[PDB]
Amino acid sequence: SIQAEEWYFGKITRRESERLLLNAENPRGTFLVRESETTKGAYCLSVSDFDNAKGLNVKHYKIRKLDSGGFYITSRTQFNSLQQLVAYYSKHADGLCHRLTTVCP
Numbered sequence: 001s002i003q004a005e006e007w008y009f010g011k012i013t014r015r016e017s018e019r020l021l022l023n024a025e026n027p028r029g030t031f032l033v034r035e036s037e038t039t040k041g042a043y044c045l046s047v048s049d050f051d052n053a054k055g056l057n058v059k060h061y062k063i064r065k066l067d068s069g070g071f072y073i074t075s076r077t078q079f080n081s082l083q084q085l086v087a088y089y090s091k092h093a094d095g096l097c098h099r100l101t102t103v104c105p
């Protein structure tokens with residue numbers, strides 16, 4: 001039950017997620033989950049990053065959900081819920097630009 005989640009922003013655009021994440025106050029790993037704009041039934045994990053090369057910037061990762069039940073970004077690493085996916089990526093960066101740290105204000 002994902003809508004209950006404070007990091008779940010629902011139906012907002014890619015541009016809007018970037019407006020929110022590009023705030024100078026945001027540390028690396030600030031994030032939110034939103035609906036994909038054009039992939040039905042898919043979500044998008046939008047995450048802030050920072051480096052001296054690019055400065056503050058944003059990356060988007062597609063989250064797939066199977067009818068069979070699993071949620072994932074990479075099929076090799078699946079979760080029983082979106083909440084568990086978020087908790088896992090708050091500990092492991094794996095292939096993300098940064099581990100998830102703080103919910104986007």
Ligand SMILES: O=P(O)(O)C(c1ccccc1)P(=O)(O)O
Nearest residue numbers: 014036037038039044060061062
């Ligand atoms: O789902 P798409 O529409 O292809 C798109 C997207 C691209 C990359 C990751 C997640 C979603 P966005 O939602 O338009 O940013």
